[PDB]
Write an enzyme that holds these catalytic residues in place. Structure first.
Site, PDB file in Angstrom:
ATOM      1  N   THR A  14       0.827  -1.203   0.000  1.00  0.00           N
ATOM      2  CA  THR A  14       0.000   0.000   0.000  1.00  0.00           C
ATOM      3  C   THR A  14       0.865   1.259   0.000  1.00  0.00           C
ATOM      4  O   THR A  14       0.512   2.263  -0.630  1.00  0.00           O
ATOM      5  CB  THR A  14      -0.956  -0.027   1.198  1.00  0.00           C
ATOM      6  OG1 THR A  14      -1.898  -1.090   1.013  1.00  0.00           O
ATOM      7  CG2 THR A  14      -1.733   1.288   1.327  1.00  0.00           C
ATOM      8  N   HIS A  50      -3.266   4.824   8.335  1.00  0.00           N
ATOM      9  CA  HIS A  50      -2.043   4.088   8.623  1.00  0.00           C
ATOM     10  C   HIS A  50      -0.830   5.001   8.558  1.00  0.00           C
ATOM     11  O   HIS A  50      -0.739   5.881   7.694  1.00  0.00           O
ATOM     12  CB  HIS A  50      -1.887   2.935   7.633  1.00  0.00           C
ATOM     13  CG  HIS A  50      -0.987   1.844   8.118  1.00  0.00           C
ATOM     14  ND1 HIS A  50       0.387   1.925   8.043  1.00  0.00           N
ATOM     15  CD2 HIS A  50      -1.264   0.647   8.687  1.00  0.00           C
ATOM     16  CE1 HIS A  50       0.917   0.819   8.536  1.00  0.00           C
ATOM     17  NE2 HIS A  50      -0.062   0.029   8.933  1.00  0.00           N
ATOM     18  N   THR A  84      -6.690   0.493  10.411  1.00  0.00           N
ATOM     19  CA  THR A  84      -5.908  -0.561  11.049  1.00  0.00           C
ATOM     20  C   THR A  84      -6.266  -0.716  12.522  1.00  0.00           C
ATOM     21  O   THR A  84      -6.360  -1.839  13.033  1.00  0.00           O
ATOM     22  CB  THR A  84      -4.418  -0.259  10.896  1.00  0.00           C
ATOM     23  OG1 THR A  84      -4.081  -0.205   9.501  1.00  0.00           O
ATOM     24  CG2 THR A  84      -3.587  -1.341  11.558  1.00  0.00           C
ATOM     25  N   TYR A 122      17.707   0.907 -24.323  1.00  0.00           N
ATOM     26  CA  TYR A 122      17.882  -0.547 -24.308  1.00  0.00           C
ATOM     27  C   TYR A 122      16.559  -1.299 -24.124  1.00  0.00           C
ATOM     28  O   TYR A 122      16.497  -2.499 -24.426  1.00  0.00           O
ATOM     29  CB  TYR A 122      18.909  -0.944 -23.236  1.00  0.00           C
ATOM     30  CG  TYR A 122      18.361  -1.099 -21.828  1.00  0.00           C
ATOM     31  CD1 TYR A 122      18.035   0.006 -21.059  1.00  0.00           C
ATOM     32  CD2 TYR A 122      18.183  -2.361 -21.266  1.00  0.00           C
ATOM     33  CE1 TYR A 122      17.525  -0.131 -19.774  1.00  0.00           C
ATOM     34  CE2 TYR A 122      17.686  -2.512 -19.978  1.00  0.00           C
ATOM     35  CZ  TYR A 122      17.354  -1.399 -19.238  1.00  0.00           C
ATOM     36  OH  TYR A 122      16.856  -1.551 -17.958  1.00  0.00           O
ATOM     37  N   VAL A 181      11.991  -0.764 -12.040  1.00  0.00           N
ATOM     38  CA  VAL A 181      11.993  -1.210 -13.432  1.00  0.00           C
ATOM     39  C   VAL A 181      11.529  -2.663 -13.479  1.00  0.00           C
ATOM     40  O   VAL A 181      10.441  -2.952 -13.989  1.00  0.00           O
ATOM     41  CB  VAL A 181      13.375  -1.034 -14.092  1.00  0.00           C
ATOM     42  CG1 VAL A 181      13.309  -1.365 -15.594  1.00  0.00           C
ATOM     43  CG2 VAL A 181      13.872   0.396 -13.902  1.00  0.00           C
ATOM     44  N   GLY A 182      12.335  -3.583 -12.931  1.00  0.00           N
ATOM     45  CA  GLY A 182      11.961  -4.986 -12.929  1.00  0.00           C
ATOM     46  C   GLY A 182      10.768  -5.275 -12.033  1.00  0.00           C
ATOM     47  O   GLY A 182      10.388  -4.480 -11.170  1.00  0.00           O
TER      48      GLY A 182
HETATM   49  C1  LIG Z   1      18.926  -3.554 -12.909  1.00  0.00           C
HETATM   50  C2  LIG Z   1      19.486  -2.188 -13.189  1.00  0.00           C
HETATM   51  C3  LIG Z   1      18.766  -1.137 -12.645  1.00  0.00           C
HETATM   52  C4  LIG Z   1      17.260  -1.248 -12.494  1.00  0.00           C
HETATM   53  O1  LIG Z   1      16.948  -1.807 -11.250  1.00  0.00           O
HETATM   54  P1  LIG Z   1      15.481  -2.248 -10.773  1.00  0.00           P
HETATM   55  O2  LIG Z   1      15.721  -3.219  -9.645  1.00  0.00           O
HETATM   56  O3  LIG Z   1      14.665  -2.905 -11.857  1.00  0.00           O
HETATM   57  O4  LIG Z   1      14.778  -0.991 -10.309  1.00  0.00           O
HETATM   58  C5  LIG Z   1      19.432   0.010 -12.228  1.00  0.00           C
HETATM   59  N1  LIG Z   1      20.802   0.109 -12.372  1.00  0.00           N
HETATM   60  C6  LIG Z   1      21.531  -0.913 -12.935  1.00  0.00           C
HETATM   61  C7  LIG Z   1      23.028  -0.795 -13.092  1.00  0.00           C
HETATM   62  C8  LIG Z   1      20.870  -2.058 -13.349  1.00  0.00           C
HETATM   63  O5  LIG Z   1      21.603  -3.073 -13.902  1.00  0.00           O
HETATM   64  C1  LIG Z   2      -2.187  -3.485   6.098  1.00  0.00           C
HETATM   65  C2  LIG Z   2      -2.497  -2.018   6.022  1.00  0.00           C
HETATM   66  C3  LIG Z   2      -1.574  -1.183   5.409  1.00  0.00           C
HETATM   67  C4  LIG Z   2      -0.170  -1.712   5.206  1.00  0.00           C
HETATM   68  O1  LIG Z   2       0.608  -0.931   4.329  1.00  0.00           O
HETATM   69  P1  LIG Z   2       1.863  -1.578   3.525  1.00  0.00           P
HETATM   70  O2  LIG Z   2       2.595  -0.435   2.867  1.00  0.00           O
HETATM   71  O3  LIG Z   2       1.394  -2.560   2.465  1.00  0.00           O
HETATM   72  O4  LIG Z   2       2.756  -2.345   4.462  1.00  0.00           O
HETATM   73  C5  LIG Z   2      -1.960   0.097   5.019  1.00  0.00           C
HETATM   74  N1  LIG Z   2      -3.258   0.528   5.236  1.00  0.00           N
HETATM   75  C6  LIG Z   2      -4.177  -0.301   5.847  1.00  0.00           C
HETATM   76  C7  LIG Z   2      -5.586   0.139   6.097  1.00  0.00           C
HETATM   77  C8  LIG Z   2      -3.795  -1.572   6.247  1.00  0.00           C
HETATM   78  O5  LIG Z   2      -4.709  -2.393   6.850  1.00  0.00           O
END
Ligand SMILES: *Cc1c(COP(=O)(O)O)cnc(C)c1O
Ligand SMILES: *Cc1c(COP(=O)(O)O)cnc(C)c1O
Ligand SMILES: [Ca+2]
Ligand SMILES: [Ca+2]
Ligand SMILES: [Ca+2]
Ligand SMILES: [Ca+2]
Lengths: 490, 475
Positions: free
Chosen positions: A151, A190, A249, A335, A356-357
């Site tokens: 969240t 929260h 919560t 790329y 990104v990933g």
């Molecule tokens: C993998 C890559 C990123 C992107 O990272 P994410 O985990 O997808 O946000 C950034 N910098 C370098 C050098 C990368 O190889």
């Molecule tokens: C579980 C809960 C969250 C938790 O937030 P995360 O960023 O996913 O850890 C936020 N708001 C409410 C109402 C929740 O019950």
């Protein structure tokens, strides 16, 4: 010659993991929910350094059973009653296992078409179960969704979109105008919302935590919101973003979504609905009224990894205009360029998130819906609520206890009343009686209960719904509370 | 009466998943790496609405086999040569499966002591493999370090939370009233730093006018020139801006350039700017002594991240962030230096990888990928029609058909078109997935060695296909 995905190891390591899981579910209830370890025990038992040489995977699993499992808090226990349960299912674990093995990285559609198209399909199916307005999914629509980990990320990316729009329309000189933006949420929101605000660069002096009280069952009063936002507008600040929560919560308060959106529309402020927990209940018609007005908000998130039998992580974010998010979040590095992305006919989900990933999270969510179906998912919500109603009516039948707020979902807030026993004459005494009760239930190992503060009062939360938990677990929990309470008086 | 974790379903569903996985690895090489589907294919195959009633899990698995798998890009294929491979291992998959079944949420130490300590332990183990100073470590052998780590989801998340910490520190250093002085803060990185870093800078509220992308050229093999960095930061300081944060990358995405870490740390120290080393991919190679020199100077930077889910055999998500001397911000990770609060037990799979295979096998994993990349690089260098565009530092080789290779590669514009054509023909065979980049204004093919099922004969076979395809193109 070292082949980490060789056929023999893949089959036997995973079979050993499945055996562990079968044993774990059969034996977890017999373990103490909370462990009895000291900080630092783990490096003492494992070593301070990684091994130079390899070991049979049977040894890794033995150390799992000997050193890891005994130091765990058992979220899967039927006697885990804290926070909100992390509900789970065989279909979801199966789906996440398959995703981990294929291990595709879905930053673009082309990077793996099925991963992105299944995520879109799972989001659409869930939006249908929730009866979201069609403006939230996607032929002229601009709505759509993304599966995120948390969240907090859903809050962060919508805060960034609202921030960028406010700065642009208010004539900020770059970010020189950021210190004039204001954001609003009830004090039951929260804590992670306020942190996301700080992450996105909002001034802490302009992050408004609006007080709530028992008069609205701790839901946001829209009159109090309008007064705060108007006062800011009159002072030259720019009201930028409001967070409304359905199912807070602490006590499962519910903000009035439509009334909040109408107030915020006077200022063109972004409205996000946080329904992380209780959103799942809105697949049932008798709960869907808590989302009335969602057709007038900008975004809404909920977490299947709370109450929809999908293991962590899985948070679904829906927006009425994806262009508002991709405008702030998109990148176009050389790329990653490809014909499908260039065509405009796909959404690359790197443009809807921070990173990104990304994992193939759509698979486990689709597998849960595809295998179990809507009717079973609805009965899962309803049976949890009915167990919670059993517990609430048991608390109400004992004059030593009071139910502190009305129960909307599967969480009951209760406490030892003042004037209930000699050890609880005043309400400051009853506070310490409840803290004693809680710490006594936890040392038993047959419960994990945690507390909250509701209107200046110490309150015990009882959050029903751990996936292994049945009705007799809740009733036995009540007997243990009753029994522990009597022994505290004498 | 419906029990989603009942013993019979848990065993039978998981056994069916394990069977699918075993079959998948045995057969993935026979599939085309890149699928032949068009956008929207899936909604034409599967139902438009969720089913009202339940179905046997066999039906779910049949739709996975029939409609999902044919539309996937097979990252696990030995013929996947794109981006950076998502290397994986049976131990990592097992660990993530166990984490999903226990399904704990470690937002405090008490919410699961084992989970927090294992993440701290996994981070401290990897820090030793990387030979990080004890200023980055939580526990040492007999006592405590002065730093800390956290297991995040992405390198982007690591950049964001370190940018935010540096932003807030600079606002206090500069006497800003809240965020009133945010528009004075400047940030710096080479133009080869991932675009997600400049996005993270905008997310944290830095002014676009103050986000500096420092040009690089072939004279430094596209590594950051610290003299160029100094010139840019001094200029901003003389103009009244506050130099706040510098990102140095070891192993850039496009061409695996390496920024000079120690030199960047010294330039940045003159302004008290935060220095973060991004080693998302190449960081894993630095567990080998012949690569650890790339991290010389890390004792003087503020933070460093790398991603085991690229090159250290751990399935996504697993990005490790280390922060030096965390007092400036009993046994806990830096849980406040992540975007969210409640997320998975990511540390279990990382520990299982290190505990099951050990340091020596992890090092040979790195070395044998590099050796395969060297084989490919020497094969390219042996064919006059091609050129290796930059020196190969790790397991990525950048190459192209050169201008003058053929009559269809006469001008440099023609060579660009021929390289794009080669890439598209390779991908159409299903026996490879190659993607491109641009280096010094030229269209370049990347060849990223290391997909976990990939062996040396796969790499030699890809080179033969490259030669064959290029010959057919030049007629
Ligand atoms: C993998 C890559 C990123 C992107 O990272 P994410 O985990 O997808 O946000 C950034 N910098 C370098 C050098 C990368 O190889
Ligand atoms: C579980 C809960 C969250 C938790 O937030 P995360 O960023 O996913 O850890 C936020 N708001 C409410 C109402 C929740 O019950
Ligand atoms: Ca576009
Ligand atoms: Ca239940
Ligand atoms: Ca000791
Ligand atoms: Ca290899």
């Amino acid at each position: 010659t070292f082949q980490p995905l060789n056929a023999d190891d893949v089959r036997s390591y995973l079979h050993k993991a499945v055996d562990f899981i079968s044993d774990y579910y059969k034996s977890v209830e017999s373990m103490p929910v909370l462990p009895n370890v000291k900080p630092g025990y783990l490096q003492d038992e494992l070593r301070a350094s990684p091994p130079t040489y390899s070991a049979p995977f049977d040894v890794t699993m033995k150390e799992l059973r000997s050193s890891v499992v005994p130091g765990m808090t058992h979220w899967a226990s039927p006697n885990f009653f804290a926070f909100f349960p992390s509900t789970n299912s065989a279909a979801a674990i199966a789906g996440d296992l398959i995703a981990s093995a294929m291990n595709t990285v879905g930053f673009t559609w082309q990077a793996s078409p099925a991963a992105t198209e299944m995520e879109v399909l799972a989001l659409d199916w869930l939006a249908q179960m929730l009866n979201l307005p069609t403006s939230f999914m996607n032929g002229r629509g601009t709505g759509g969704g993304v599966i995120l980990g948390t969240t907090s990320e859903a809050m962060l990316v919508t805060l960034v979109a609202a921030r960028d729009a406010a700065l642009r329309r208010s004539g900020s000189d770059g970010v020189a105008g950021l210190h004039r933006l204001a954001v609003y949420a009830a004090d039951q929101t929260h804590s992670t919302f306020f942190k996301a605000c700080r992450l996105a660069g909002f001034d802490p002096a302009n992050i408004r935590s609006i007080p709530t009280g028992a008069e609205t069952d701790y839901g946001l009063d829209p009159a109090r919101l309008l007064e705060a936002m108007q006062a800011d507008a009159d002072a030259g600040l720019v009201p930028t973003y409001v967070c409304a929560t359905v199912g807070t919560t602490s006590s499962n308060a519910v903000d009035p979504v439509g009334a909040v959106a109408d107030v915020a529309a006077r200022f063109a402020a972004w409205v996000h609905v946080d329904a992380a927990y209780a959103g799942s209940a809105c697949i049932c018609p008798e709960f869907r009224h808590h989302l009335d007005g969602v057709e007038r908000v900008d975004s809404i998130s909920m977490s299947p990894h709370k109450w929809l039998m999908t293991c962590l992580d899985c948070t679904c974010l829906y927006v009425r205009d994806t262009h508002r998010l991709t405008g702030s979040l998109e990148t176009n590095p050389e790329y990653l360029k490809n014909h499908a992305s260039d065509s405009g006919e796909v959404t690359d989900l790197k443009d809807m998130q921070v990173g990104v990933g990304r994992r193939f999270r759509g698979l486990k969510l689709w597998m849960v819906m595809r295998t179990y179906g809507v009717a079973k998912l609805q009965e899962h919500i309803r049976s949890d609520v009915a167990m919670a109603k059993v517990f609430e009516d048991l608390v109400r039948g004992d004059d030593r206890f009071e139910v502190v707020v009305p129960r909307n979902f599967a969480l009951v807030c209760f406490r030892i009343r003042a004037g209930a026993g000699a050890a609880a004459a005043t309400e400051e005494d009853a506070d310490e009686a409840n803290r004693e009760l809680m710490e006594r239930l936890n040392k038993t190992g047959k419960a994990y209960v945690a507390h909250t503060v509701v209107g200046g009062r110490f309150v015990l939360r009882f959050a029903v719904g751990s996936s292994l938990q049945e009705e007799h677990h809740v009733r036995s929990a009540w007997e243990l509370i009753k029994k522990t309470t009597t022994e505290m008086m004498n």
